[PDB]
Write a protein that binds this ligand. Structure first.
Ligand SMILES: Cn1c(=O)c2c(ncn2CCCC(=O)O)n(C)c1=O
Length: 501
């Protein structure tokens, strides 16, 4: 019968109800705020601050396509003026859009393949859908792109490695920026520690995934150019310098809800939603990937702009994004992913007019050899990564939502689900958060995670006791194991070890 086990999900803390009343929104050395805070009002489009466009062109800020420093060889010409010229033409065929984008990307005229764009327009859409795309959606997208200097007036700092810094910007500013990314306008982003931002890889090859990606993104573009979204989104890079001594951590485990049904994004509303991220945030979203991270970034595209400014994550870092809106629904996953329909996001907004949706990008390690992940160094790494993603310095536990997650770094990256579940349970306990864990049809893993959790909680083991058990497993079954897998599985080992004692 049972579709879930443990603590009822109803009993887990959610935003906005668990939330702290926010401090007043204001810019500081660690918080860039790109709108008029004095004028922020529910239901109104935020007004950019400053009033007039200010340009920085340096290695600490985004290089804006509308910068006077964005030049091209004629004698230098203004590449911004060239962009305007190229994009302010009627498109009636996909080649027209390709050629427009190539006018200010001349160096890529042989490298960039547009097959997926051509096939989407010509071979996937119905004739009327194609016509709507080129008569309405694309010209609307061009106009919001070309409005960039009136919309994004404030230089945007890069979130570079080791910085602890936030950027709070409007959904409207994001929309403008992403339309630019679609038209591949961001300079010096094509030719190494930053993800791709321009959408050029979205247009290449013949993956059956590409039409679904494109439909999902057009769903967003149609929505945000028809009526400006009125909210804000904050991006925070978080870097911890000190990590727990896990073997000494005396904290108790927290509560668990575990289910083989539901999704993170729908069932975990209001909770801290894990993005199973690439270290290059968004991974394959505007190229060939389509698993958990790429899906979330497609259905909540404001996530994608993190790639404009977020340097590759180091082992002690994460990215926390608050306020992204869901614009699409889907079915399937990976090679069966399909766009279903438009989504009307019902989420409340906090006092900064952010949707009460908090997502954290934590990248797992890739394990070439399965046993490599049980090495103490590798276990501590994953614990500390997840801990960084879950910890909110200067917030009490009662104000912290549950963590909504699942088999983080399992699948392509070769992670063990039962290990990673326990790692996350320990990270969460240390950060004083409950765990809501989704196994996506895998009912045996639901029961196993549940049985281990209740076992350890009833015997009141601490984070440190459990971590020492993981060390014993490494020392006794892994370190001098003759074979690809060890003699005894982790969970059975832990049950025998504690029941022994
Ligand atoms: C993280 N995650 C999943 O793992 C998931 C899934 N749906 C099926 N699955 C299971 C994997 C199915 C597949 O491998 O194609 N969803 C929606 C998901 O978020």
């Amino acid at each position: 019968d049972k579709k879930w086990l443990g603590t009822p999900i109803e009993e887990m803390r959610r935003m906005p109800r668990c939330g702290i009343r926010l401090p007043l929104l204001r810019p500081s050395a660690n918080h860039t705020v790109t709108i008029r805070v004095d004028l922020l009002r529910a239901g109104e489009v935020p007004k950019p601050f400053p009033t007039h466009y200010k340009d920085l062109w340096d290695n600490k800020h985004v290089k804006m396509p509308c910068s006077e420093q964005n030049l091209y060889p004629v004698t230098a010409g203004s590449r911004w003026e060239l962009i305007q010229t190229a994009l302010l033409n009627k498109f009636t065929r996909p080649q027209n859009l390709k050629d427009a984008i190539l006018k200010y990307n001349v160096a890529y005229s042989k490298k960039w393949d547009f097959t997926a764009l051509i096939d989407f327009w010509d071979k996937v859409l119905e004739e009327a859908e194609a016509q709507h795309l080129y008569q309405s959606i694309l010209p609307d997208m061009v106009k919001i792109a070309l409005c960039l200097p009136n919309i994004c007036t404030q230089p945007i700092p890069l979130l570079a490695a080791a910085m602890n810094h936030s950027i709070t910007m409007s959904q409207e500013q994001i929309a403008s920026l992403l339309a630019n990314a679609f038209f591949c306008t961001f300079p010096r982003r094509n030719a190494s520690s930053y993800p791709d931002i321009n959408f050029n890889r979205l247009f290449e090859g013949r993956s059956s995934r590409k039409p679904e990606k494109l439909k999902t993104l057009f769903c967003y573009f149609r929505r945000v150019t028809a009526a400006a979204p009125t909210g804000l989104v904050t991006f925070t890079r978080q870097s911890l310098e000190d990590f727990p001594e896990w073997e000494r951590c005396e904290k108790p485990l927290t509560r668990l809800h575990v289910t083989y049904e539901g999704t993170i994004e729908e069932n975990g509303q209001g909770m801290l939603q894990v993005d199973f991220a690439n270290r290059f945030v968004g991974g394959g979203v505007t190229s060939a990937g389509l698993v958990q991270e790429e899906i979330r970034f497609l259905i909540n595209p404001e996530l994608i702009i993190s790639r404009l400014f977020t340097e590759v994550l180091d082992h002690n870092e994460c990215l926390i994004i608050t306020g992204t809106e869901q614009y699409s629904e889907y079915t399937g996953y990976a090679e069966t992913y399909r766009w279903s329909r438009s989504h009307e996001d019902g989420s409340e907004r906090d006092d900064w007019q952010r949707r009460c949706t908090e997502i954290v990008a934590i990248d797992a390690l890739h394990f070439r050899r399965y046993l490599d992940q049980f090495v103490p160094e590798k276990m501590r790494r994953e614990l500390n990564k997840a801990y960084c993603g879950f910890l909110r310095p200067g917030v009490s536990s009662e104000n912290l939502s549950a963590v909504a997650t699942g088999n983080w770094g399992c699948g392509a990256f070769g992670g063990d689900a039962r290990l990673k579940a326990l790692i996350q349970i320990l990270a969460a306990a240390a950060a004083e958060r409950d765990v809501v864990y989704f196994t996506f049809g895998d009912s045996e893993l639901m029961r196993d995670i549940y049985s281990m959790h209740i076992f350890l909680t009833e015997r009141k083991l601490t984070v440190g006791d459990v971590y020492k058990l993981l060390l014993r497993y490494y020392n006794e079954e892994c370190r001098n194991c003759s074979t690809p897998g060890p003699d005894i599985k982790l969970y059975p080992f832990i049950y025998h070890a504690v029941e022994s004692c």
